[PDB]
Amino acid sequence: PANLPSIFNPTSADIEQLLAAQCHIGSKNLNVHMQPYVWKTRADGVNIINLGKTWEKLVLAARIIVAIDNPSDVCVISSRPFGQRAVLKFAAHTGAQAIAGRFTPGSFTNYITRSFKEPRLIVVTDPRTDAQAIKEASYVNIPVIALCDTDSPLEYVDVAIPTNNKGRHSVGLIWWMLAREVLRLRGTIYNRETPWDVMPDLYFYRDP
Amino acid sequence: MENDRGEIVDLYVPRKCSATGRIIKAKDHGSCQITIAKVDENGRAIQGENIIYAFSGFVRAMGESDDALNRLAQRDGLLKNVWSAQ
C-alpha cells in the first residue's frame, strides 16, 4: 500500500457482474507475452483469465485517463459491429471523441483531411482488428490502451486489458465499468459506495 | 555531459528510458510518456501531483512495455501481486 489505500479492493457486486458476462472464456491460441496473466489452461478446453487481476489493472487504466487535463484530448476507436454503440455512449457520458466504423487512414498524419485530430491518448477495442490505427499512432508519440483476448499482438501497446474481447456482453460491460471508474475517480459520483443510476444493458448492441 | 570550469557546455541533456536505461534520441517516434494520477484517502484524484515514466521506441517495437509497466508499478507500489519470478 505504498500509493493506494485498502478501499480499492473490488466490491461484492463487481465479481458477479463480471462472471455473468462470460469474460473468463478465451480462444485456443495462447500468447507468450500474456503468460503472466494466465493461471492455467482448462483440461481439454479454453484458457481462463483472472477478473481479479483485471480489476486493479483496469483501475490503473482509469487513473491514466483522469490524468489528462481536458477530456477532449482522449480518442476511442472501434470498427467491429459489436462496439459502435458502447463506444459512442462512453463518449457521451464522459468527455472523449469516438471513431466508429471506417477509420479513413491518414487521420493523424494528414492536416488536410476532414477528420484531423491531435489527441493525447488512444483507447482501442481490439489490437488485431484496429492494427492499422496503432501503426500511425506509433508516428507521433501517443500512448494506447487496448482490450485484448488470450491471443493478440502487443506491438506499441503499453496497457492491455485481458477480457473476452469477442463476447456480446463482455465488451459492453467492460466499457461501461471503465466509464464508472473514471467518473468515480472524478467528483461526479461523489462517493465510492453509492450505486450508479444507469443499467448495464445500455452499453450493448441491438440488431435493428 | 562535459564541463570545463563548472559551467555546462552541452546544448541539451537527453532523458533515459526507465525500462532499459537507453537514451531516447530526438525524432525517435514511437517513444511515449506515461502519467499516472495519484488518489487520496477517500478516493478523489489529487490534481497536479503525479509520477512520470518514459518508454523508448525499441521496447515498444518488441512489445514488452506492458511488462515493464508492471515492473515499475510494483516497484513504486502501484499494483499488487501482478508480476513475479517463476
Next chain:
Amino acid sequence: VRTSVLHDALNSINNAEKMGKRQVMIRPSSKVIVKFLQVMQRHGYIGEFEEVDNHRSGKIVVQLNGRLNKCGVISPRYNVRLAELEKWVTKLLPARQFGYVILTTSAGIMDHEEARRKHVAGKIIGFFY
C-alpha cells in the same frame, strides 16, 4: 570445439545487453572469468553475479543493468612492449577519457591505465568500453 570460454562469455553478455536483458548465462567458469568479473564491477558496468557449483565445472550468472556498451576479446595473445601500448588505445577505444584495455602480467590481470602506472607490459586478453 570450445577454444575460448572467455570469448563465449563476452559474446553472450554482449548479445544479451544489446537485446535489453538483465541476466545472462555462462556455461563454463574459469579463474580468468571469475577474476574478470570483479574488474567489470569496479567500474560499475555490471551488477551482482552468482556462480552455482555443480561438480562438473560450475556456471556463471551475471546481472546486467544496461550501462554497458561492448565487451570483446582479442584471440591471438600478442606481445606488446610498454612504449607502444598507446597504439592499442588509439586503435580500439572510442576515447582516452573512458574505456579500458585489459592486460595480463605476472602481477595479475589489470586494465591498461593501472598497468601504465605499474610500468609493466605483457599479453592482451580483451577490452571494454
Next chain:
Amino acid sequence: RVRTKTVKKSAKVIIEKYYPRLTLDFETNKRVCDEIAVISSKRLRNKIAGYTTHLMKRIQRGPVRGISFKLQEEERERKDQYVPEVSALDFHQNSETGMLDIDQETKDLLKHLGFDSIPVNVIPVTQS
C-alpha cells in the same frame, strides 16, 4: 444512362437539406427545384428532379446507405436509450435459483481473491 458527379452532389445536398416538405411525386419536384436552386439548364433541371423522385421511392421503403435525411436523423438519437426492465446479465431474478454454475479453477480463483462467501456450484467439464 449514367449520371456524373454534378447531378450527384446536388441530389444529395437537396435531399438532405429539404426532406419533409417534398414528396414522391415528380411533378412537384420539377417546379420546386428552381426556387431553392440556381441552375442554368432546363434539361439538367429535369435530370435532378427525375433522379430525386426515384430516390424517394427507395426512401419510402426502407433506408439507403449514405443518406440521412433530417427525419431519419432525429429518430436514431431518439432511440439511443432502450431500457429493458430486468437486466439480461443479472441472474438473481432472471435465474430461478440465484446460485449459478462455475468450474473448479474458477472457484479456486475465488479462494485466491478471498471472496469465498459467494454461493456458487462447481461442475466438472472434460472430454479428453
Next chain:
Amino acid sequence: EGEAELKDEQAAEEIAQTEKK
C-alpha cells in the same frame, strides 16, 4: 543540364559559385 537559370537566380547558393572573368 540545369544550367540555364544560374546566372540570375539569387534564391540559392551554389557550391562553386562561377566566378566571371
Next chain:
Amino acid sequence: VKKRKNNGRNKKGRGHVKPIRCSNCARCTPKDKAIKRFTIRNMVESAAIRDISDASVFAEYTVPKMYLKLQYCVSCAIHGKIVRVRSREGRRNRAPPPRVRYNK
C-alpha cells in the same frame, strides 16, 4: 535468381528419385516434379444414363465408376490448360482451388 524456394521439384533431403513417363509426349520426368491428376468418371455420359437404365435387364442398375491417374510434364501442363501462369505474389500459394459448389 531463385524463382522458387523448392526449385519447382519438391525434393529436399535425398539425392535421387526414379523418373516416370509423361502421358502425352512420353518424356521422362522425376515423379515428384510431374503433375499428377486423379480422375473419377462414369462409364457413359449423363445423357445416356436413362438409355442404359431402360435397356438393362436387371430392373434398377448402378453404372460402375472409372478411375485414372494421369501425369504430365510441365511443357504439357500449360499447353493443355491444366495449369496456368500466376502472379509473383500468387505463385507462393499451395492451397487447392475452391471448387464452385452452387454453379449459379
Next chain:
Amino acid sequence: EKEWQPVTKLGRLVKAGKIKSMEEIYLHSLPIKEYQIVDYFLPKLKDEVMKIKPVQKQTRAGQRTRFKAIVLIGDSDGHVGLGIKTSKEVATAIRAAIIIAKLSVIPVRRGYWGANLGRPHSLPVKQSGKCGSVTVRLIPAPRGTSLVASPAVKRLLQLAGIEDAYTSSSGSTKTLENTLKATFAAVANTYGFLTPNLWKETKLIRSPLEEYADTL
C-alpha cells in the same frame, strides 16, 4: 508571404510565445511538420545546393524529363539538415527542397580532444554510418588542423559547426547524394552514444503539450 494561420497546436503556442526555447522540443522529440517553426526561432540559417541532375522517363511520344535537387541547411553552430525533392522545373524543386531541408534540422554534439580548454571543438567519440553501399567516418581531431575530407562533405562539416575532425570513406562513394545522407546519419548519431558523463539520474517533467491549454 503574409502572416500565417497555425494548423497545429505547436504553431499556436509558438505564435503566442508560450514555449521557452527549442531544447525542450528536442528533449521531448516531437515531430515537426510546419516550416515556420524553424525559421521563427532560428534566423540566419544558410542553405546550400549541391548540383541539379535530370531524370528521364520514356513514353510513346518520346522521353520526359524531371529535375532532382540536393539541398542542405545549417547555421554553423550546431544545427543542420537536408532535403531531397524532385519536380518538373528547377525553381519548384529548389523551393520545396529548401522547405523540407528546414523541416529536417538536427542538432550535433561536440566536445574536446584530449584535455579540456572549453570552447567545444571536436567530436566526443568516433562515429560512422552506412546507407546502401556508402560508409562515412568521423574521427575526433586535435585543435587547429583544417578539415580532411572530400570537397562535397567538407561543406556539410563546415555548416555543422564542427571545426576539427578526421574522415575516412569506403565503398562506392560515387553517389554523392547517398554519401551526404550517410554523413547526415553519422552526425545525427553523436547524441546517440551513452558516454560515462551521462550516468547521473535525471528528473522527468511533464510535457508542455499536456500542461499548456491551447486557444480556440
Next chain:
RNA sequence: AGGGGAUCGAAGACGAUCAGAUACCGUCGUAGUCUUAACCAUAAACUAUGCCGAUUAGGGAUCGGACGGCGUUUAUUUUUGACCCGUUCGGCACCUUACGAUAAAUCAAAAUGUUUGGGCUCCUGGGGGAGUAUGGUCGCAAGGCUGAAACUUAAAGAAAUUG
C-alpha cells in the same frame, strides 16, 4: 574378354513436309540397354551456400526412442496392440515477423563485422587469346591432372524500374 540378346534405339536404309531438310513426323534397324572378371575418375556430381564450437523469435505440423494421463475398441481377453491429450531428445522441412545484414532478389543465417580478431583447409582480381601452346605425369585407347606467352580491347557483367 565370356554369357544373354524381349523392348527401345547412336550409325544406316526408306516414306512425307519444304525452294532446299543429311532434322523435327512414320515403318525397320547395328553398337548399346542386362550379367560375370578387370579399366576409365569426369557431370548444372546444385542447397550454384566448406568443416567444428557458442548465443539470438513466435507458431503449428511431422519420423524414431523414452516418460505421464482420462477414456474407446478388442481378443483364453488383463499389462501389451490400435486411437486421443501434454512435456522432452535427435532429424527431413514449413508459415509470419526484422531488433539485424545485403546493390537488390531475398536470409533464424546470408545475424552476433568500420563498435572490424573462436579454430582449421581451398580458390578468384576487367573482357578475349585460353583450359590454348609447351614440359611433366597417369591410362590399352578415348582422355585425366598441372598449366603459359605474344597479341587485342573501354567496356563485358549482376539486381531491380518504365516500356
